[model samples]
Target chain A: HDSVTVLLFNSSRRSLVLVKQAGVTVELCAGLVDQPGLSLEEVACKEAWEECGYHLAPSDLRRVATYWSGVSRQTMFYTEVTDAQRSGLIEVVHLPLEGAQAFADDPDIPKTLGVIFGVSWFLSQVAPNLD
Target chain B: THDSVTVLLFNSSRRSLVLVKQFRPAVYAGEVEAGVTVELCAGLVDQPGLSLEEVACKEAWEECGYHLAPSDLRRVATYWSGTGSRQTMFYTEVTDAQRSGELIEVVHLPLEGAQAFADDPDIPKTLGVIFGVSWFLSQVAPNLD
Candidate 1:
């Protein structure tokens, strides 16, 4: 199904914030674009709030890339957050920028390809700009 | 574009990743040159009573011409691809002995150079291939140069 995933990077801590879903499985804060009259950016912000408990303004997000995963076309967004913006929902894990790839590669954790590609794209493309 | 299974085939004997390149009407409609795309071997899971791995194995043979057993397949992850579509991703390794010598423009991407290939703007590769290679390098062959 069509979806939007957020690369919710904590600029203050230089880390990425991920959420726990379906029990122990960790994934990027994401959800289906099922809300009518809501833009992709709006849905992304909504998911971040509903799934991860973070308040984000529409302007805080930026579209990074869009790609096809299987039959679904996914749009990815990048946003910077900090502890000040953390209000509270899902079980959250903070992956420091340097250790994110390792965390994503850990087979013990059930993660979506969206998370893997998000980390990969962040490391190679987005992280450099912030660094 | 419906429920499907994607197989990321690896040929350890050749130290390369197996893929298929062919024309996509969607890409062609988007005005990409020839609308050709390089992607992991995948198949629609339309058959009832067959497991995803079974569909993947059948696709590997049909698309990449590799005969793979269920034991040889590794279940990676399952996730949504688009509206009303879900995909199960499977990874499997094959030796040269498994090749059926088929067509559909099989591409053997050298393992060492996969990152570059993935980044190449003109290749028109799919995200599944990119994700597979990223996972392979980070998880399976982290030290491969």
Candidate 2:
């Protein structure tokens, strides 16, 4: 079971690219267990490019953590997308949901976004480490 | 600015996991057909002085008619990926005997109640619960089973 979620960053130090679908606001990019033996890192890179338009090498992604629930198991990654690097990527379609950008520093996000990203965990780890 | 807890219950008797599927306007605007949501049993930290396990236990009872002690709770993994919200993660094991009286399936759930995972596909694509359960089956459930 290979799945991935990336903590995206951009010029806004706290920037997070996200997609809005079915009115649900979640991470900028994510990959389901759609491919067999593709490897999670590959899936992570694939999602980052597909969703936010940023392409990452497997080496560009860092394994920040892993998590599980009764329904999902995720290999989490974090990448610092600078203004220059992010400027180079293109806007892309990832999920069926609508798309938008968000930031951990923005208090309004948790209140307005959907529960797809587990706001609690983002603040706990990613928000504090945003750089 | 505190958060809540969500515990996924594993029933050895059923070799399955307990999950809730309901409509969450935040996740899916109700206007768009009530917002499909399939998730682990979760509750708010609406009270003070209760431990995380205690909150999870109380939510378990109020949500699904389970009368479990704090000892039954097992803290598993913690995560943060809900686009931008936060919550704690927990796990617990129980059986039909643990119910307060009987498993009131429809009472704990919203108008549209609960379901099991690690096998059900009726779930919406919006939820990440199934991925966690799938990971459990491939990784932890062998010993768990």
Candidate 3:
């Protein structure tokens, strides 16, 4: 299985979008592996819009890390939404991902995956020097 | 379509690490340059409602024949196996059950097929596994048996 995961940074709020889905450990995001031959880049962009309502262009995304997780290959992407893109922002819009919760609450994050993990602890571990 | 896990067994003080070897058809089918794979103890996240830690400890019991308490298991990370599926990785050093969490314990190395690739020069070994071994040798091996 081939899939993509994105970590969206909302520059407006100085925060990264975090999500929680049932049956998952803690870290999670919109995912779709096979999309009728859709490139992972396209799929990443689409999942962002569908789950978090952030319309990202393919060029807006940059690959961060690639590793074999389990039985699948997942590529992680990172992007920052600037003030110019705020007009397209839907902080909490219509989401079709059932049983999934997305947020930017910096304090509600778990220590399990935090490095000063405010709202997005992953940055510290995966991209500590990202900022 | 099948999801799996690869466990990295370490000693209680986090010294010695357990590594297993087995033949992987997919390794060769996908990477013609590779055949056998050395992996940490791992299993699938298919059991419904159980946490990754739970799935991990359970797999440790079944595959490695070691019953590890949840506290005996450390939550490492849940990662995608690059195949689109996901698996949660954990680090735990299990011992022969004195107080739980030791240097290492039962390793589920299927003897029949392990040497098949580990001993063969024809099959390419996975760099990740090799690197893990090297890391252990450099980092943890110094204090190991």
Top DockQ model: 1
Off by over 4 Å in 1: A1-6, A11-80, A84-112, A119-131, B101-103, B143-145
lDDT, model 2: 0.54
Decide which is better by TM-score, 1 or 2.
1
lDDT ranking, best first: 1, 2, 3
Indicate the residue-level lDDT of A92 in model 1. Answer: 77
Local accuracy of candidate 2 as per-residue lDDT tens digits, A54-109: 76778878764454432245556767665555524324423211122124224334
lDDT string for model 1 (B1-145, tens) is 5678998987888999999987676666555326677888988888888988999999898888889998899976665533345677898778899998433777899987998887664566677887787778766785544
RMSD per candidate (Å) reads 6.0, 12.4, 10.3
Off by over 4 Å in 2: A1-131, B26-36, B81-85, B101-122, B125-128
Give the top-scoring candidate (TM-score).
1
Give stretches of model 3 more than 4 Å off.
A20-27, A33-37, A67-70, A86-121, A125-131, B1-7, B11-39, B43-89, B93-145
- Interface DockQ per candidate: 0.23, 0.06, 0.05
lDDT of 2 at A69: 32
True lDDT of residue B26, candidate 1: 68
For each candidate, what TM-score against the reference? 0.66, 0.48, 0.47
What lDDT would each prediction earn against the true structure?
A: 0.77, 0.54, 0.50
